[PDB]
Amino acid sequence: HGKRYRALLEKVDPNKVYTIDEAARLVKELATAKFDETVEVHAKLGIDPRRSDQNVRGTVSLPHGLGKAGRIEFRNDKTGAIHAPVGKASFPPEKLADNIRAFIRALEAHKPEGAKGTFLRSVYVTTTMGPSVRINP
Amino acid sequence: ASEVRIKLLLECTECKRRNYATEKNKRNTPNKLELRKYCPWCRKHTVHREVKI
Amino acid sequence: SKVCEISGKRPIVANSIQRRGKAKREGGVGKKTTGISKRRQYPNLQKVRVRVAGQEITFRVAASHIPKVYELVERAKGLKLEGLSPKEIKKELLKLL
RNA sequence: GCCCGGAUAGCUCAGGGUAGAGCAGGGGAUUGAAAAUCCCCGUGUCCUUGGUUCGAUUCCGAGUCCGGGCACCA
RNA sequence: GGGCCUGACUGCGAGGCCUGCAAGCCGAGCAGGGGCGAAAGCCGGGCCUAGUGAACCGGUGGUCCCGUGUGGAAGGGCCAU
RNA sequence: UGGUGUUGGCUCUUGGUCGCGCCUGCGUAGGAUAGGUGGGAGCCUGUGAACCCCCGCCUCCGGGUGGGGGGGAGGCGCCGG
RNA sequence: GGGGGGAACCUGGGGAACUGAAACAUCUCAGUACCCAGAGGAGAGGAAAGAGAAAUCGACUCCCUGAGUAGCGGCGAGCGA
Ligand SMILES: [Mg+2]
Ligand SMILES: [Mg+2]
Ligand SMILES: [Mg+2]
Ligand SMILES: [Mg+2]
Ligand SMILES: [Mg+2]
Ligand SMILES: [Mg+2]
Ligand SMILES: [Mg+2]
Ligand SMILES: [Mg+2]
Ligand SMILES: [Mg+2]
Ligand SMILES: [Mg+2]
Ligand SMILES: [Mg+2]
Ligand SMILES: [Mg+2]
Ligand SMILES: [Mg+2]
Ligand SMILES: [Mg+2]
Ligand SMILES: [Mg+2]
Ligand SMILES: [Mg+2]
Ligand SMILES: [Mg+2]
Ligand SMILES: [Mg+2]
Ligand SMILES: [Mg+2]
Ligand SMILES: [Mg+2]
Ligand SMILES: [Mg+2]
Ligand SMILES: [Mg+2]
Ligand SMILES: [Mg+2]
Ligand SMILES: [Mg+2]
Ligand SMILES: [Mg+2]
Ligand SMILES: [Mg+2]
Ligand SMILES: [Mg+2]
Ligand SMILES: [Mg+2]
Ligand SMILES: [Mg+2]
Ligand SMILES: [Mg+2]
Ligand SMILES: [Mg+2]
Ligand SMILES: [Mg+2]
Ligand SMILES: [Mg+2]
Ligand SMILES: [Mg+2]
Ligand SMILES: [Mg+2]
Ligand SMILES: [Mg+2]
Ligand SMILES: [Mg+2]
Ligand SMILES: [Mg+2]
Ligand SMILES: [Mg+2]
Ligand SMILES: [Mg+2]
Ligand SMILES: [Mg+2]
Ligand SMILES: [Mg+2]
Ligand SMILES: [Mg+2]
Ligand SMILES: [Zn+2]
């Protein structure tokens, strides 16, 4: 890892869970690359990968989002993960939590009807080249 | 009955309640049975489905 | 096996019941007793040796009350115990229960 | 009743990219014979159907049948 | 032999046959919702007479009747198998 | 005969599994050791690139991979076959 | 101070079988007979970590009732607050 990244690592701490708001305040502190990084929200659906019927797929029209308007399409990969762009590192903090939360909502709205586990086994917020923070969905 | 002549029920296909029991020969008739039949619950005739006894 | 020197516990009588069949909660027609018979249940009696006032004093004790033997030694401090034969010391110790 | 399982060519069999292996059968070499040995060749929705993947005997659902396991029987 | 179909109905059931009991058997008619028939009508399996097994215990599906101070739940009842 | 009590000390070798760290994945066309996908036009370098030396080593034998000595300015992608 | 004895009565520790179930094993006889220890003129029990549905009662013992009820039960024979 590069000094630049090693730096950021300090402003994190894995143990801590954080909050949609607490994470939104960090994003900016984590976007140290020469461009408007994104942000991304990585989940980890607690459903069976190799299957169908219980496949999470759809779209969400984020109120602000992207800035690159909304309607992002997301689809769970072969593993139990699902990923999506929630906006660019710019965006005032009180603008991301609105999307993070608006996106996570859609995920729950697309949970199957036959799924074992806590569904959102885990969730994280990040930036294109920065580290990541778990969050209380 | 026997292992091949088998007993079974007939579930009303609207309310799902089992209203009738009968038998079929599952060699002669692998197709799950469909019979219009009167459901006392729905009080109208209704297609009923073979459903395991 | 006899009697707890500390607790008084002694053997009780119990039945050995033998059942068959599948319990009703498991979808079974039910359990049936195929035998009942008397047996005895003994206390977990063990020996505990301790030195107290330089004499060896041993107890027959329920494993459960083993530490109560030690408490008992600990309370034997404020006691004039010298000269004493092991028999009379023990006497003195259980006088503290 | 529930749980674990095998199905791949004539018989027996091991196996996310594929389809082969033993001897049975046939052709050839050899032999006095029977063999043994040796060289070639076949004999496939990989039980069924439906679904993943760019595709699959391979993953999954559902079926059908034999194999096994445990339990129960008013 | 063919066409349409599922009455191989649901709720009852006058009246009988048979009969030590318990069973067994036949049944017109009325209501509901049907089938076939122009209709009269017929159909509550099968030309008939064997193809069967009381109760107890328990399985499953409904029902929503009981629910041990109360609300629920455990468990049970009732209908069906 | 298993578990457990009465039942303690010291080591050595281990597996199950919770976490985190980190590599391993090679049909065929090809720069060649393609994990699934979503993100991403830039990022690896004075917190020292390019090869050079010991190599923990893994291997489908072509390579992947990781600490440190030499090390003082060029490597790796969108391109696009 | 103990020790031993006392017709029955009492409390504790232990604890059968015939028999009944028109066979028998759970169940019954029955915690009975009996053995043992200990009491006394009685013994046991006794002043709520109770009852159990009344915003209730108020230690224990004994009789009547509740009641062959509630329930228990190879839901059998029977058992029984
Ligand atoms: Mg019928
Ligand atoms: Mg038939
Ligand atoms: Mg009908
Ligand atoms: Mg009804
Ligand atoms: Mg036992
Ligand atoms: Mg019983
Ligand atoms: Mg203990
Ligand atoms: Mg006809
Ligand atoms: Mg009559
Ligand atoms: Mg009669
Ligand atoms: Mg009518
Ligand atoms: Mg009509
Ligand atoms: Mg008409
Ligand atoms: Mg008419
Ligand atoms: Mg009639
Ligand atoms: Mg009985
Ligand atoms: Mg019953
Ligand atoms: Mg009710
Ligand atoms: Mg109620
Ligand atoms: Mg209660
Ligand atoms: Mg209640
Ligand atoms: Mg409530
Ligand atoms: Mg219930
Ligand atoms: Mg019920
Ligand atoms: Mg043992
Ligand atoms: Mg041990
Ligand atoms: Mg005396
Ligand atoms: Mg006496
Ligand atoms: Mg007694
Ligand atoms: Mg006695
Ligand atoms: Mg005896
Ligand atoms: Mg007896
Ligand atoms: Mg006897
Ligand atoms: Mg008898
Ligand atoms: Mg008799
Ligand atoms: Mg006899
Ligand atoms: Mg008794
Ligand atoms: Mg008196
Ligand atoms: Mg008195
Ligand atoms: Mg007293
Ligand atoms: Mg008091
Ligand atoms: Mg009885
Ligand atoms: Mg009794
Ligand atoms: Zn109906």
Side-chain angles (χ1 to χ4, degrees), chain A, chain B, chain C residues 1-86 88-94 96-97:
Chain A
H1 282 296
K3 57 158 291 186
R4 168 261 171 184
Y5 173 87
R6 291 201 209 73
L8 287 299
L9 251 182
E10 174 52 67
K11 324 177 182 180
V12 177
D13 161 44
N15 322 309
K16 207 176 185 274
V17 178
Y18 285 90
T19 72
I20 305 298
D21 153 27
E22 267 165 353
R25 331 162 135 160
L26 251 165
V27 294
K28 330 269 189 166
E29 256 81 75
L30 306 180
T32 75
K34 312 300 203 315
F35 64 105
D36 221 339
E37 290 183 49
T38 293
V39 65
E40 335 180 59
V41 170
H42 301 301
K44 175 52 185 173
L45 281 27
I47 80 302
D48 161 62
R50 315 90 61 210
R51 236 279 281 189
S52 61
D53 207 61
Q54 75 161 189
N55 262 19
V56 182
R57 193 187 191 187
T59 64
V60 204
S61 184
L62 294 164
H64 316 298
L66 287 184
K68 185 198 308 163
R71 183 168 154 190
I72 47 141
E73 38 172 297
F74 54 94
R75 175 221 294 184
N76 70 289
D77 53 38
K78 97 186 174 183
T79 44
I82 179 79
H83 326 285
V86 181
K88 306 202 80 74
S90 164
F91 281 144
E94 31 270 299
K95 193 91 75 170
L96 295 168
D98 282 281
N99 296 55
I100 300 295
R101 192 171 296 149
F103 166 60
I104 193 165
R105 280 295 196 59
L107 281 170
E108 209 295 289
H110 277 73
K111 172 193 179 184
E113 47 295 298
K116 165 200 67 292
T118 327
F119 193 46
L120 298 177
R121 296 190 56 61
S122 82
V123 181
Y124 289 76
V125 183
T126 186
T127 51
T128 310
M129 326 292 265
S132 80
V133 303
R134 291 210 50 168
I135 57 169
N136 200 307
Chain B
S2 44
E3 106 96 345
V4 39
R5 185 136 217 127
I6 90 213
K7 304 177 189 142
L8 63 112
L9 305 177
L10 293 178
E11 219 186 58
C12 157
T13 210
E14 312 192 15
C15 63
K16 318 295 201 181
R17 302 175 164 101
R18 291 88 164 278
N19 290 353
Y20 291 87
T22 185
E23 29 154 291
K24 76 162 181 222
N25 174 313
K26 74 176 183 183
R27 255 199 107 196
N28 292 1
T29 292
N31 282 11
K32 263 64 198 115
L33 293 212
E34 269 138 274
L35 287 156
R36 302 224 327 139
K37 211 106 208 138
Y38 175 85
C39 152
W41 291 103
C42 314
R43 8 220 284 85
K44 94 245 243 135
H45 277 61
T46 280
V47 28
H48 282 39
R49 172 95 39 181
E50 154 153 26
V51 106
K52 170 140 161 283
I53 202 154
Chain C
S1 304
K2 274 204 119 315
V3 166
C4 189
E5 236 142 21
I6 286 341
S7 82
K9 272 201 211 173
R10 49 196 310 132
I12 77 186
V13 239
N15 297 314
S16 180
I17 309 155
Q18 296 268 334
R19 319 168 176 274
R20 288 181 163 199
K22 159 184 306 141
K24 294 203 192 155
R25 98 198 329 157
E26 298 172 289
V29 94
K31 296 250 70 171
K32 299 181 205 334
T33 291
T34 226
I36 307 236
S37 124
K38 284 167 170 316
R39 35 86 51 116
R40 274 162 103 234
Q41 280 180 337
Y42 293 113
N44 201 345
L45 274 209
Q46 310 298 326
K47 303 181 213 74
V48 177
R49 295 177 325 157
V50 241
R51 155 153 293 97
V52 126
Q55 307 275 352
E56 167 171 89
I57 305 307
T58 99
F59 295 79
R60 306 240 276 126
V61 105
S64 79
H65 283 48
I66 297 213
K68 190 99 195 278
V69 172
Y70 292 90
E71 167 171 311
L72 264 213
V73 168
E74 219 58 19
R75 320 234 289 272
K77 296 291 189 56
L79 253 46
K80 302 158 122 274
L81 288 194
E82 263 70 350
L84 291 170
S85 81
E88 49 204 14
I89 287 161
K90 190 168 186 167
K91 257 203 180 151
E92 235 39 62
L93 292 178
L94 300 320
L96 301 176
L97 294 162

